Structures are given as structure tokens and as C-alpha cells.
Amino acid sequence: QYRIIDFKRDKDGIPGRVATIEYDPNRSANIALINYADGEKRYIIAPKNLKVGMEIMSGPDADIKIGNALPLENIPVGTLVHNIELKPGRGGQLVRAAGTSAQVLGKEGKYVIVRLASGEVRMILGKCRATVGEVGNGGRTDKPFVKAGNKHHKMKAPNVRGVAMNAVDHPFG
Amino acid sequence: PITKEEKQKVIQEFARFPGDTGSTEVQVALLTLRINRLSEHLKVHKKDHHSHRGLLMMVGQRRRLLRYLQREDPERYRALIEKLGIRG
RNA sequence: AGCUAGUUGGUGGGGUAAUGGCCCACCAAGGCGACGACGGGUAGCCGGUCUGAGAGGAUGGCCGGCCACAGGGGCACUGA
RNA sequence: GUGGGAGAGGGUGGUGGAAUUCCCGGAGUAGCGGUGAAAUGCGCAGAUACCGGGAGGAACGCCGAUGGCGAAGGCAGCCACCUGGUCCACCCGUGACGCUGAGGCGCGAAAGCGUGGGGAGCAAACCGGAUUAGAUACCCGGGUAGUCCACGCCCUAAACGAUGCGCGCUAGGUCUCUGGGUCUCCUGGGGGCCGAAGCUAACGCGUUAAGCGCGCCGCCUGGGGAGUACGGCCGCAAGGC
RNA sequence: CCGAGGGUAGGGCCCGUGACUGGGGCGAAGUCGUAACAAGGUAGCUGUACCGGAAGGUGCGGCUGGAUCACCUCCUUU
RNA sequence: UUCUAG
RNA sequence: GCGAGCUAGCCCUGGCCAGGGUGAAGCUGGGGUGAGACCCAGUGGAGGCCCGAACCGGUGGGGGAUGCAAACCCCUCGGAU
RNA sequence: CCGCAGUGAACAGGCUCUGGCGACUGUUUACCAAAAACACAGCUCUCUGCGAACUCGUAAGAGGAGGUAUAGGGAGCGACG
RNA sequence: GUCCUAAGGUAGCGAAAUUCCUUGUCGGGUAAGUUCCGACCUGCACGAAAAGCGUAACGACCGGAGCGCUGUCUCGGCGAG
């Protein structure tokens, strides 16, 4: 419903309980309200799995318990993640419903290796974080916009195209 | 899997007479039990087509034993079906 | 490879020598089929006839029985 | 029933080296690689070979076998999870509960298609090099779809033992595996080989029958046109019945 | 009311039938090539896929109705 | 590599 | 310098589409198999979906040409959650 | 029972057979042209790892996008087969 | 058999809205048909990506034909405002 919310933990020792299935319409991410100890909440990432009955978190410590997330430092090798913590705390550093996250495919000193979900590879840094678990996007692909144009229903630009025009109009155009 | 003491509590359950180690009452009870944790196994493991075919033989083994008891005494056949719960 | 509206049965009833959905009313819907129904192709069916070691193949014009048609298509009369 | 036993039957997850090709560093030359002999090709921007490191699929050497499992196709590095079939011994339990099976219903090589990953190597197509008369093929150097997996679709084939299933009767010698026994051998299953009776037109089958008898099945019935045309069912189509 | 017959329309089963075109069979014999039986010269046949004046070829699978010792590993036994 | 039919 | 009370857009915030028709997901029940596939029947009510007012339009013909008018009148037509 | 007529008047598809292009509802050249023109749902190459890449901007800055490679921009075709 | 080129048009299609010689030649439709529609195909100059062959439904799109029906027409002739 035209809004944002959470995207980056950094208060820990906190109790992570899988709020609920609030599959969400606004970023290809499907998240559920994450119930913290105090009671303070957050429509959190959609890293598939972690059943309703919440039951997680993270921590400077550890707990690969699927989903969840800590610094690079605190992370296995051969592991699949998201909550792409690029720079030191820059919260998320990639993978948006981009299921196929990154896989600490080898780390090095204040530098941890990452399979570039998108489609390449290089390294991050020290404390830098990132929570494993999948994504959530049920292949959020495909699906037919049949005899109409989902598009429009887009609210998402018919910013339509052209290219053939009659003129000689717009940038590199 | 099927436990050995589970098998006996089933054999004891269905026996009309203390010592019924093999009879219509036991066969069907065995085969039906073997039918419900083999089919349960095939729902996950979608493609176990070798053990599915070996199940279907056993499916046909049941029915023919069932056939016999209706052929002789359909009175205890209505008692055997309801108790188990097969046919619909 | 599906077939069916008089179609399957019933109540009453017309008509007929009189049975019968045979024709009609009203009622409920069933009746059929691979143990080949519906459709298509073709046809006079038999006693007998020709052949055959035979079982079985063919065939059934004149003599005989039952049947059909009277140029094609129907209907009624008189009337046992 | 019970009590053992074997196996690459299956399907889910997981790990294990061996090497393969690409990538970063070391070292270190001038040639490599390749055939019937060459050539195309790589390489002085330093390749091939060796050292070390990496990443990645994909199979799975020796054991492994003329051996094993399985309904058919077909199935092999170890792991555990569900699970099928199938075999000796006790002779305990039911009590003829059976044997065949139109149609169906399910499986089911490999090619292929549908979408979604992945692509080390192999490899039609296509590309060069050779070749001869000619080279659209053999031979050499490249390389794409596929081959890989999930999921759904095709179901065809020298799908082979070219040979339905069941039981029961008719000498044997011999190799091997599995299960039991008084375990110099007898026993029940299973696999290879020789060989009496017998069948055969011919080879050859021969208690693993192509012998002798009983059920129930499918298929035959001159060669081409044909396994095709037409009607019908089925597939996204290539086709397929 | 039922109905012989006549009409307009709609479909179904079939015979004829056509420019043209796919193939199939004959026919003295024609051209171009070697596919096939001796490893027919690359052994052949096959499901399929692509490609090639044409026989065919190459790939994935396989069946031998494939066979020699022109070579290796050994096997199996007195 | 090819060389008809009787 | 001057302008989106022209018009093309874009942001924010309200209002508006008389009636009718077609009948997919679903859920209920029944249906030969192990569960099912899956069938059917009921309910059900989607779709830039159909038939059409207002409303949006302005092909196809008619008039008009110092018009009613610097684009309008007439018959006609498309769209119609 | 009645008239030539019984939606009696009034509002109310002519249908069919075929072909070509573009699939389709559309959108557009206000005052000629609504079309085989653009638009598309859909495909393919593709630049981009963020403080993105391209667009405005004299330097800030906004956009992008509080998006983050099932994504954002560049594109030639424009179901599906 | 060759001379040149980087190879030197492949599958589908074809007088198509790319074919002027042309109302091309054969076929059907007709009392005759230079429009159509099928087929050949010597494609004056199609062709796979500004896709290529086809394609149910879909179109105020364009072109071809049949019934149904009417002053559109065989000259109309009357009338109402």
C-alpha cells in the first residue's frame, strides 16, 4: 500500500521471531512482520522460508539458522546469502527478491568473497554483514497479462516506447 | 519404517483366535498398513516408479483376498471393511 | 460406439375379430449396446441344389412352402 | 507368520578422491600439436612441458567379473533417510483364497519438445584443413543444439533371448552365485557351458526346451506398392496408434 | 388433427471430378555416381535428430542377423 | 571407381 | 520578457459509468482407482468481455460555404469498470 | 373472438461466401485523413554493482530509487505457432 | 567446366500491394472478368529479424463475390412540409 519500512538490522541480542506472511507489493520482496523482544517491529526482508511462527534473529555472535544475518567476518564458506551488506553498515547491498543471492564463495582477510548474484564476482570487506537464507520471490517471474496489459494496471509505465517515431526526437534517439 | 512390535500389535488386533499368525484378517491388515506408508512415501519422492509398480501388485493382492471373504462370508467382510475403512 | 420423444413403462381409453404405444390423452422416467447396438454395404429366407473321402465350401431358376410386388406413392369403400 | 540372507532394484539428501578444460602467481626455453605423410591451428604480446594455487561441472578408474539386481526399459565412489522386489530354514497360521488376461491403467532407452538453471568435456548441424576425377562422407584442426538437473510432454526401437504367461512329466556331467544342512556332500532358488531321450525342413533348443501334456493370451497366413494413402483417436510440433 | 406428394434451408454417408501436383508401379534402355554381400574399401542394420544433386553422411541410444590372431590383458584348466 | 539384357 | 483558465503531459485530491447479458478460479455435494488425476452437477460471480443510455467519439453519407458557427446542424457509427 | 395485419405507434443487426494486413480493448495527426501508423502484453541483443549507467544541471543538485541484476536504463520486432 | 568475390540464398513463399514485358500462361467463377481466388512460377527487383510462411478470435481498416431487399439505376411520375 504505497510505502516502505525496514531493511537492515544493527540492533542485536534482540529476539528474532518470524512475524508473519505479509507478502508485500512494492519491491518484489515478500516480507512478514518481524517481532522483536521489546515489541518493536519491522516489515522485514522476504528471504523465503522461516515459517510464520517466526523464530529467529542474528547477532554479533552467530546462528546460521537459515535467514538471519551477521557481518561477513561471522559467516561460513560455501554459503548462500542476501541482505547484501556492501559497505560497512550500508544495510542491504543487493539482492532484492533477487532470490539467487551471493555465496561467500571464499573470503580473504578484511575481505570476504561473494558470487555476484546479478552475474559476476569480487570481494566485500571486514565487519560488513549480510543475512543468509533464500529470497522469497516465488520465481516472481512469468505469469500472463493476457488479453490486456498488466503494464497499465502497472500503475507501472505505459511510459510506452516507440523508436520508429516520426521526427528525430529524444536522447540517443 | 514398520516396527516389529507394531506388526505384532496389528496381528493381535485383527486375530479372532489367539494364534492367528496368518489369515485373511492378518493379510489385509498387513497389506493395507503396507499400502498407507508406501503411498505416503510416494507423494514426496514423486518419481519412485519401481516401488510404485511393486505397490500396485500389492494393491491387487489385497483386493483378491478381500474378494475371497465376500465370496465366502460377506457378513464378516462388512465387518472387515468398516473396521479398516476401504471402498469408496 | 454410441442409440432413443411415443421413446420405455404405467393409468385410463380409441380402434380393431381381439393382445399391443397400434393411434391418443395424462403421468413417471426408463428402455438399448460389444453376449456388436445406431449407421453403412447387400438380400427373397428355407425344403432342397452343385461340390466334397469328409467336416466344410457354393447355392437356393423351374416343383413346393412362407413372404414381397403389382409402372412409382398412398388411401379408403363394399365386405366372413 | 517368524527367523535369518543377498543384491549396480528405486527415489531424497549428502559428502570423496582421480583426472579434465578455463582462470591468478613461479619457473623456463623455441617450438608445439597433429597424420598414412601434411596442412589448417596455436606460439617472441614466451606457447607445448613442469611447479603451485584456484573455480567448475561431469562421470565415477583398480576392485569388477564370462558376476550381480530388476516387471520391461534398464541400473554401478562412499553416506544415511523413506521404499519395492526376491531367496533358504521352522513348519507354526488361513484355508483353494487360483492360473490367463479384450480394452484400459501405469511405466518405459536414446533422439526431440515445453519452460526454468547450467555448459568442464564430448558433439549432428555449420566452419575451416585434407582428399580425389569429385568429396557435401572416412582422416585432422574448431565449434552449436543437445548430452547435464528440476519440472511437465512424447511411448517410439535389431525394446533381442528376433522366441506370452502358469503349473506339472522326461538321464546326465560340469562351472558360479545366493540361502540352509550330519559343511569328502546332500539340499531350495539363481546364473554360464557340454550333453540321453525328444522335437526340427534347417541350424540348434535339450528340467533356464525350440521335448511331452493342461489352461488362457496376442500374432500369423505369397513378394513389391506398405506399412503407405484415406477416415478415425493422439502430440506444442517431429510425428505417433 | 394425422398424412401421398411439392417447396426453401440446413447437415450427414458415398460415386464422379478437376488446372495442378506428391509419390507408387511398369518399360528396350538413358546419365551421375558407390551405398550394400568378402573390414564392399568408413563393418552393416536400427529409433531418432540435423545436414547433403541423388545413393547417403554425421551425431545420441542401441542390436548384432558383425568377425579376423595380422595387436594387448590375461583367462580356464593337470 | 565403373563396365546392360538374353 | 510574456503564457498549461489553448493543449500535451505529469503530481495531489473528489466525483462519475440507467439497465441488461455472458457465465472461468473457487467453494458444496455426488462420481469406477490407493489417495488422486480427472469427470459432472450445484453454487458462484471474474473480464481493459458482450448488447446497449447518459457520457467519451467525432469514420461513412446528408446540409451548410459573405453559414447558427473561423467546425457547427442531420441521418449514421465506435467505446460503454 | 376479431382485422390486411396482434414487439399493432415509438424507440430497435441486413446476412452470407472469400481474401490481404495488423492479432486482439486501444491510442493518435484539435478545423479534411482513427489506418496495414504508434501502443503493445511477448521476444532478443545489451550498457550498469551502485555514491549506479543514461537525462536535465554553470559546480550544488535532483532524477534515478529509499531501486538494488527475477533489478534499473539502450533498443529492432511486436500474441501464439 | 571455369573467371572474379568476403561468402555468392538456404528452409517457407511467389505475377503477392516486392513481377512494368501483361488485360504473363493455365484453371474456376460469368453472357462476356485487364479486379479477384487457385495453380505454374523465365521472382523486370521476396526472404527471416524495419522478421519469414501461416494463424482462431478480433477491425467504423482495404479488396473480392452470393442470397435478401429497395427510384442507386431502366427518364421516373405524384406528394408533403
From Swiss-Prot, chain B:
Native source species: Thermus thermophilus
Keywords assigned by UniProt, alphabetized: Ribonucleoprotein, Ribosomal protein, RNA-binding, rRNA-binding
Q: What processes in GO biological process is this protein linked to? A: translation
**What does the protein in this record do?**
One of the primary rRNA binding proteins, it binds directly to 16S rRNA where it helps nucleate assembly of the platform of the 30S subunit by binding and bridging several RNA helices of the 16S rRNA. Forms an intersubunit bridge (bridge B4) with the 23S rRNA of the 50S subunit in the ribosome.
Superkingdom in the source lineage: Bacteria
Cite the record's note on assembly: Part of the 30S ribosomal subunit. Forms a bridge to the 50S subunit in the 70S ribosome, contacting the 23S rRNA.
Q: Which Gene Ontology CC terms are recorded?
A: cytosolic small ribosomal subunit
What's the name of the protein? Small ribosomal subunit protein uS15
What's a single GO MF annotation on this record? rRNA binding
